[PDB]
Design a protein around this ligand. Sequence first.
Ligand SMILES: [Cl-]
Ligand SMILES: [Cl-]
Lengths: 188, 188
Amino acid sequence: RTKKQAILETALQLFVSQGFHGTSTATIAREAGVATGTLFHHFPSKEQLLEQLFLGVKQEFADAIQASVSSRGDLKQDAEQLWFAALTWAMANPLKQAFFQLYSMSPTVEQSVRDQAMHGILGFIAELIRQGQASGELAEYPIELMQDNCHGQYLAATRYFVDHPERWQQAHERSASFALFWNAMAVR
Amino acid sequence: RTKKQAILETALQLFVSQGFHGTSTATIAREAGVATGTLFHHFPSKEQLLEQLFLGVKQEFADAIQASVSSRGDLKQDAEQLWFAALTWAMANPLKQAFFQLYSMSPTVEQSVRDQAMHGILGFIAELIRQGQASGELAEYPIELMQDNCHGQYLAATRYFVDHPERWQQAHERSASFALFWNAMAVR
Ligand SMILES: [Cl-]
Ligand SMILES: [Cl-]
Protein backbone atom coordinates (compact mmCIF):
# COMPACT_ATOMS: atom_id res chain seq x y z
CA ARG A 1 0.00 0.00 0.00
CA THR A 2 2.82 2.44 0.96
CA LYS A 3 5.42 3.32 -1.76
CA LYS A 4 8.31 1.96 0.34
CA GLN A 5 6.34 -1.31 0.99
CA ALA A 6 5.53 -1.83 -2.74
CA ILE A 7 9.31 -1.47 -3.49
CA LEU A 8 10.35 -3.88 -0.66
CA GLU A 9 7.67 -6.52 -1.65
CA THR A 10 8.47 -6.24 -5.42
CA ALA A 11 12.28 -6.38 -4.69
CA LEU A 12 11.74 -9.57 -2.58
CA GLN A 13 9.91 -11.27 -5.50
CA LEU A 14 12.52 -10.21 -8.10
CA PHE A 15 15.67 -10.89 -6.00
CA VAL A 16 14.37 -14.46 -5.58
CA SER A 17 13.17 -15.16 -9.19
CA GLN A 18 15.95 -13.21 -11.04
CA GLY A 19 18.72 -12.67 -8.46
CA PHE A 20 20.23 -9.43 -7.15
CA HIS A 21 22.53 -8.61 -10.14
CA GLY A 22 19.94 -10.06 -12.56
CA THR A 23 17.42 -7.44 -11.35
CA SER A 24 17.60 -3.77 -12.31
CA THR A 25 16.25 -0.87 -10.15
CA ALA A 26 14.12 0.13 -13.26
CA THR A 27 12.39 -3.29 -13.21
CA ILE A 28 11.82 -2.99 -9.39
CA ALA A 29 10.36 0.56 -9.71
CA ARG A 30 8.08 -0.41 -12.67
CA GLU A 31 6.81 -3.65 -11.08
CA ALA A 32 6.18 -1.67 -7.80
CA GLY A 33 4.43 1.11 -9.73
CA VAL A 34 6.83 3.90 -8.60
CA ALA A 35 9.10 6.35 -10.48
CA THR A 36 12.84 5.43 -10.41
CA GLY A 37 13.36 8.71 -8.48
CA THR A 38 11.03 7.50 -5.66
CA LEU A 39 12.98 4.19 -5.43
CA PHE A 40 16.33 6.02 -4.95
CA HIS A 41 14.82 8.39 -2.33
CA HIS A 42 14.00 5.51 0.09
CA PHE A 43 16.94 3.33 -1.11
CA PRO A 44 20.03 5.23 -2.47
CA SER A 45 21.47 2.00 -3.95
CA LYS A 46 20.26 -1.50 -4.91
CA GLU A 47 22.73 -2.77 -2.23
CA GLN A 48 20.93 -0.71 0.51
CA LEU A 49 17.52 -2.03 -0.70
CA LEU A 50 18.83 -5.65 -0.41
CA GLU A 51 20.30 -4.91 3.08
CA GLN A 52 17.04 -3.32 4.36
CA LEU A 53 15.00 -6.20 2.91
CA PHE A 54 17.44 -8.77 4.43
CA LEU A 55 17.27 -7.28 7.97
CA GLY A 56 13.48 -6.83 7.65
CA VAL A 57 12.82 -10.50 6.76
CA LYS A 58 15.33 -11.64 9.48
CA GLN A 59 13.37 -9.49 12.04
CA GLU A 60 10.02 -11.06 10.92
CA PHE A 61 11.53 -14.58 11.29
CA ALA A 62 13.01 -13.79 14.75
CA ASP A 63 9.68 -12.23 15.91
CA ALA A 64 7.58 -15.24 14.67
CA ILE A 65 9.72 -17.99 16.23
CA GLN A 66 10.06 -16.14 19.60
CA ALA A 67 6.27 -15.34 19.73
CA SER A 68 5.59 -19.12 19.23
CA VAL A 69 7.52 -20.02 22.40
CA SER A 70 6.29 -19.71 25.97
CA SER A 71 9.10 -21.18 28.12
CA ARG A 72 8.47 -23.57 31.01
CA GLY A 73 12.19 -23.41 31.92
CA ASP A 74 13.38 -26.53 30.04
CA LEU A 75 16.02 -25.57 27.48
CA LYS A 76 15.67 -28.71 25.27
CA GLN A 77 11.87 -28.21 25.17
CA ASP A 78 12.29 -24.50 24.22
CA ALA A 79 14.97 -25.41 21.61
CA GLU A 80 12.45 -27.97 20.18
CA GLN A 81 9.60 -25.36 20.07
CA LEU A 82 11.99 -22.80 18.44
CA TRP A 83 13.22 -25.35 15.86
CA PHE A 84 9.71 -26.46 14.84
CA ALA A 85 8.46 -22.79 14.87
CA ALA A 86 11.37 -21.89 12.51
CA LEU A 87 10.59 -24.84 10.16
CA THR A 88 6.82 -24.00 10.30
CA TRP A 89 7.66 -20.38 9.36
CA ALA A 90 9.81 -21.66 6.41
CA MET A 91 6.87 -23.81 5.07
CA ALA A 92 4.33 -20.98 5.67
CA ASN A 93 6.46 -18.26 3.84
CA PRO A 94 7.93 -19.94 0.70
CA LEU A 95 9.11 -16.68 -0.95
CA LYS A 96 10.86 -15.27 2.19
CA GLN A 97 12.31 -18.75 2.88
CA ALA A 98 13.69 -19.03 -0.73
CA PHE A 99 15.23 -15.51 -0.06
CA PHE A 100 17.04 -16.95 3.05
CA GLN A 101 18.23 -19.99 1.09
CA LEU A 102 19.69 -17.65 -1.53
CA TYR A 103 21.12 -14.81 0.64
CA SER A 104 21.43 -15.79 4.42
CA MET A 105 24.87 -17.43 4.18
CA SER A 106 25.98 -16.22 0.77
CA PRO A 107 28.90 -13.88 -0.09
CA THR A 108 26.27 -11.50 -1.67
CA VAL A 109 25.23 -9.73 1.60
CA GLU A 110 27.88 -7.52 3.34
CA GLN A 111 29.51 -9.39 6.28
CA SER A 112 28.64 -6.44 8.61
CA VAL A 113 24.88 -6.75 7.71
CA ARG A 114 25.02 -10.59 8.16
CA ASP A 115 26.63 -9.84 11.61
CA GLN A 116 23.77 -7.44 12.56
CA ALA A 117 21.25 -10.22 11.77
CA MET A 118 23.34 -12.89 13.64
CA HIS A 119 24.31 -11.02 16.86
CA GLY A 120 21.57 -8.36 16.85
CA ILE A 121 18.29 -9.72 15.48
CA LEU A 122 19.11 -13.36 16.40
CA GLY A 123 21.22 -12.49 19.49
CA PHE A 124 18.87 -14.59 21.68
CA ILE A 125 20.22 -17.78 19.95
CA ALA A 126 23.75 -17.30 21.40
CA GLU A 127 22.13 -16.51 24.81
CA LEU A 128 20.24 -19.85 24.75
CA ILE A 129 23.48 -21.69 23.78
CA ARG A 130 25.31 -19.92 26.74
CA GLN A 131 22.46 -21.04 29.07
CA GLY A 132 22.69 -24.64 27.77
CA GLN A 133 26.47 -24.66 28.24
CA ALA A 134 26.12 -23.34 31.85
CA SER A 135 23.49 -26.05 32.69
CA GLY A 136 25.76 -28.81 31.30
CA GLU A 137 23.37 -29.73 28.45
CA LEU A 138 25.38 -28.22 25.52
CA ALA A 139 29.01 -28.79 24.47
CA GLU A 140 31.54 -25.99 24.85
CA TYR A 141 32.54 -25.15 21.27
CA PRO A 142 33.21 -21.51 20.09
CA ILE A 143 29.79 -19.74 20.31
CA GLU A 144 29.97 -18.25 16.76
CA LEU A 145 30.73 -21.65 15.16
CA MET A 146 27.76 -23.12 17.06
CA GLN A 147 25.41 -20.29 15.82
CA ASP A 148 26.64 -20.77 12.19
CA ASN A 149 26.05 -24.49 12.68
CA CYS A 150 22.42 -23.85 13.88
CA HIS A 151 22.00 -21.66 10.77
CA GLY A 152 23.48 -24.32 8.42
CA GLN A 153 21.31 -27.10 9.89
CA TYR A 154 18.19 -24.90 9.60
CA LEU A 155 18.98 -24.23 5.92
CA ALA A 156 19.64 -27.95 5.32
CA ALA A 157 16.34 -29.06 6.99
CA THR A 158 14.27 -26.40 5.17
CA ARG A 159 15.95 -27.33 1.82
CA TYR A 160 14.96 -30.97 2.58
CA PHE A 161 11.35 -30.19 3.53
CA VAL A 162 10.81 -27.79 0.59
CA ASP A 163 12.22 -30.51 -1.78
CA HIS A 164 10.07 -33.23 -0.09
CA PRO A 165 6.94 -31.38 1.21
CA GLU A 166 5.15 -34.72 1.94
CA ARG A 167 7.91 -35.56 4.50
CA TRP A 168 7.12 -32.39 6.52
CA GLN A 169 3.73 -34.10 7.26
CA GLN A 170 5.59 -37.13 8.73
CA ALA A 171 6.37 -36.87 12.48
CA HIS A 172 9.33 -39.38 12.13
CA GLU A 173 10.98 -36.99 9.56
CA ARG A 174 10.31 -33.93 11.78
CA SER A 175 11.65 -35.69 14.91
CA ALA A 176 14.80 -36.80 13.00
CA SER A 177 15.43 -33.16 11.93
CA PHE A 178 15.36 -31.92 15.56
CA ALA A 179 17.58 -34.90 16.64
CA LEU A 180 20.29 -33.87 14.08
CA PHE A 181 20.01 -30.25 15.32
CA TRP A 182 20.12 -31.00 19.11
CA ASN A 183 22.72 -33.84 18.94
CA ALA A 184 25.22 -31.62 17.08
CA MET A 185 25.26 -29.29 20.16
CA ALA A 186 24.53 -31.62 23.10
CA VAL A 187 27.35 -32.72 25.51
CA ARG A 188 28.79 -36.25 25.00
CA ARG B 1 43.73 -24.23 -22.15
CA THR B 2 40.93 -25.89 -24.21
CA LYS B 3 38.10 -23.62 -25.57
CA LYS B 4 35.55 -25.52 -23.44
CA GLN B 5 37.67 -25.10 -20.24
CA ALA B 6 38.22 -21.32 -20.88
CA ILE B 7 34.38 -20.99 -21.04
CA LEU B 8 33.82 -23.03 -17.84
CA GLU B 9 36.52 -21.04 -15.96
CA THR B 10 35.15 -17.68 -17.26
CA ALA B 11 31.55 -18.69 -16.36
CA LEU B 12 32.71 -19.72 -12.87
CA GLN B 13 34.29 -16.25 -12.33
CA LEU B 14 31.25 -14.34 -13.71
CA PHE B 15 28.51 -16.52 -12.09
CA VAL B 16 30.21 -15.79 -8.73
CA SER B 17 30.90 -12.03 -9.16
CA GLN B 18 27.73 -11.10 -11.19
CA GLY B 19 25.33 -14.02 -10.71
CA PHE B 20 23.73 -16.34 -13.25
CA HIS B 21 20.96 -13.97 -14.52
CA GLY B 22 23.29 -10.96 -14.13
CA THR B 23 25.72 -12.54 -16.65
CA SER B 24 25.05 -12.68 -20.41
CA THR B 25 26.39 -15.41 -22.77
CA ALA B 26 28.01 -12.60 -24.85
CA THR B 27 30.03 -11.42 -21.79
CA ILE B 28 31.06 -15.09 -21.06
CA ALA B 29 32.22 -15.71 -24.68
CA ARG B 30 34.04 -12.30 -24.75
CA GLU B 31 35.86 -12.84 -21.43
CA ALA B 32 36.67 -16.52 -22.38
CA GLY B 33 38.19 -15.27 -25.68
CA VAL B 34 35.78 -17.32 -27.86
CA ALA B 35 33.17 -16.45 -30.53
CA THR B 36 29.51 -16.64 -29.31
CA GLY B 37 29.06 -19.48 -31.86
CA THR B 38 31.78 -21.57 -30.12
CA LEU B 39 30.07 -21.01 -26.72
CA PHE B 40 26.70 -22.36 -28.00
CA HIS B 41 28.38 -25.39 -29.68
CA HIS B 42 29.75 -26.62 -26.32
CA PHE B 43 26.75 -25.28 -24.30
CA PRO B 44 23.38 -24.84 -26.14
CA SER B 45 22.02 -22.65 -23.29
CA LYS B 46 23.34 -20.65 -20.29
CA GLU B 47 21.36 -23.13 -18.09
CA GLN B 48 23.34 -26.12 -19.55
CA LEU B 49 26.64 -24.23 -19.00
CA LEU B 50 25.70 -23.65 -15.29
CA GLU B 51 24.69 -27.35 -14.92
CA GLN B 52 27.94 -28.63 -16.52
CA LEU B 53 30.00 -26.20 -14.39
CA PHE B 54 28.06 -27.25 -11.22
CA LEU B 55 28.62 -31.01 -11.80
CA GLY B 56 32.25 -30.33 -12.83
CA VAL B 57 33.13 -28.46 -9.61
CA LYS B 58 31.18 -31.09 -7.52
CA GLN B 59 33.28 -33.85 -9.26
CA GLU B 60 36.57 -31.96 -8.49
CA PHE B 61 35.49 -31.59 -4.81
CA ALA B 62 34.49 -35.31 -4.56
CA ASP B 63 37.79 -36.38 -6.25
CA ALA B 64 39.97 -34.18 -3.93
CA ILE B 65 38.37 -35.27 -0.64
CA GLN B 66 38.37 -39.01 -1.58
CA ALA B 67 42.02 -38.87 -2.82
CA SER B 68 43.09 -37.37 0.56
CA VAL B 69 41.72 -40.33 2.63
CA SER B 70 44.13 -43.04 3.99
CA SER B 71 41.45 -45.41 5.41
CA ARG B 72 42.38 -47.90 8.19
CA GLY B 73 38.80 -49.22 8.51
CA ASP B 74 37.66 -46.85 11.30
CA LEU B 75 34.58 -44.96 10.14
CA LYS B 76 34.96 -42.02 12.58
CA GLN B 77 38.64 -41.60 11.54
CA ASP B 78 37.65 -41.73 7.81
CA ALA B 79 34.80 -39.24 8.42
CA GLU B 80 37.36 -36.95 10.19
CA GLN B 81 39.84 -37.16 7.24
CA LEU B 82 36.98 -36.48 4.75
CA TRP B 83 35.68 -33.52 6.77
CA PHE B 84 39.10 -31.85 7.11
CA ALA B 85 39.91 -32.61 3.42
CA ALA B 86 36.59 -30.88 2.45
CA LEU B 87 37.36 -27.82 4.64
CA THR B 88 41.00 -27.73 3.30
CA TRP B 89 39.61 -27.79 -0.26
CA ALA B 90 37.22 -24.88 0.61
CA MET B 91 40.15 -22.76 1.94
CA ALA B 92 42.39 -23.73 -1.05
CA ASN B 93 39.73 -22.91 -3.79
CA PRO B 94 38.02 -19.63 -2.74
CA LEU B 95 36.25 -19.07 -6.11
CA LYS B 96 34.83 -22.64 -6.41
CA GLN B 97 33.88 -22.53 -2.68
CA ALA B 98 32.04 -19.17 -3.15
CA PHE B 99 30.25 -20.91 -6.15
CA PHE B 100 29.07 -23.70 -3.73
CA GLN B 101 27.90 -21.08 -1.14
CA LEU B 102 25.86 -19.40 -3.89
CA TYR B 103 24.51 -22.41 -5.87
CA SER B 104 24.86 -25.81 -3.93
CA MET B 105 21.62 -25.53 -1.95
CA SER B 106 19.87 -22.75 -3.86
CA PRO B 107 16.66 -22.93 -5.95
CA THR B 108 18.80 -21.73 -8.98
CA VAL B 109 20.13 -25.21 -9.96
CA GLU B 110 17.56 -27.76 -11.30
CA GLN B 111 16.57 -30.29 -8.56
CA SER B 112 17.47 -33.15 -11.01
CA VAL B 113 21.06 -31.80 -11.37
CA ARG B 114 21.37 -31.25 -7.57
CA ASP B 115 20.23 -34.95 -7.23
CA GLN B 116 22.93 -36.15 -9.70
CA ALA B 117 25.58 -34.36 -7.57
CA MET B 118 24.10 -35.71 -4.27
CA HIS B 119 23.40 -39.39 -5.14
CA GLY B 120 25.81 -39.75 -8.10
CA ILE B 121 28.99 -37.70 -7.57
CA LEU B 122 28.71 -37.75 -3.75
CA GLY B 123 26.99 -41.18 -3.59
CA PHE B 124 29.86 -42.48 -1.38
CA ILE B 125 28.56 -40.21 1.47
CA ALA B 126 25.28 -42.20 1.66
CA GLU B 127 27.31 -45.47 1.57
CA LEU B 128 29.41 -44.32 4.56
CA ILE B 129 26.24 -43.33 6.50
CA ARG B 130 24.68 -46.82 5.73
CA GLN B 131 27.93 -48.49 6.96
CA GLY B 132 27.90 -46.37 10.16
CA GLN B 133 24.25 -47.25 10.83
CA ALA B 134 24.90 -51.00 10.28
CA SER B 135 27.93 -50.90 12.69
CA GLY B 136 25.87 -49.16 15.41
CA GLU B 137 27.94 -45.92 15.24
CA LEU B 138 25.42 -43.62 13.46
CA ALA B 139 21.78 -42.85 14.35
CA GLU B 140 18.97 -44.26 12.20
CA TYR B 141 17.42 -41.13 10.64
CA PRO B 142 16.39 -40.95 6.90
CA ILE B 143 19.74 -40.95 4.94
CA GLU B 144 18.70 -38.13 2.55
CA LEU B 145 17.97 -35.84 5.55
CA MET B 146 21.36 -36.83 7.02
CA GLN B 147 23.12 -36.16 3.72
CA ASP B 148 21.44 -32.66 3.44
CA ASN B 149 22.49 -32.12 7.07
CA CYS B 150 26.17 -33.00 6.19
CA HIS B 151 25.88 -30.49 3.34
CA GLY B 152 24.38 -27.73 5.56
CA GLN B 153 27.04 -28.27 8.28
CA TYR B 154 29.82 -28.14 5.68
CA LEU B 155 28.44 -24.83 4.32
CA ALA B 156 28.13 -23.46 7.88
CA ALA B 157 31.75 -24.44 8.86
CA THR B 158 33.22 -23.11 5.58
CA ARG B 159 31.22 -19.84 6.00
CA TYR B 160 32.76 -19.58 9.51
CA PHE B 161 36.35 -20.33 8.41
CA VAL B 162 36.16 -18.05 5.32
CA ASP B 163 34.82 -15.24 7.62
CA HIS B 164 37.50 -16.00 10.29
CA PRO B 165 40.51 -17.38 8.31
CA GLU B 166 42.82 -17.04 11.38
CA ARG B 167 40.60 -19.56 13.28
CA TRP B 168 41.24 -22.22 10.59
CA GLN B 169 44.88 -22.17 11.88
CA GLN B 170 43.66 -23.07 15.42
CA ALA B 171 43.35 -26.85 16.09
CA HIS B 172 40.66 -26.39 18.84
CA GLU B 173 38.45 -24.48 16.29
CA ARG B 174 39.01 -27.26 13.72
CA SER B 175 38.32 -30.02 16.27
CA ALA B 176 35.10 -28.26 17.41
CA SER B 177 33.88 -28.12 13.76
CA PHE B 178 34.30 -31.91 13.34
CA ALA B 179 32.61 -32.52 16.77
CA LEU B 180 29.46 -30.61 15.62
CA PHE B 181 29.48 -32.60 12.33
CA TRP B 182 30.01 -36.09 13.92
CA ASN B 183 27.74 -35.58 16.99
CA ALA B 184 24.78 -34.59 14.77
CA MET B 185 24.95 -38.14 13.22
CA ALA B 186 26.32 -40.34 16.05
CA VAL B 187 24.04 -42.74 18.05
CA ARG B 188 22.76 -41.60 21.46
CL1 LIG C 1 6.63 -15.67 1.62
CL1 LIG D 1 39.06 -21.55 -6.94
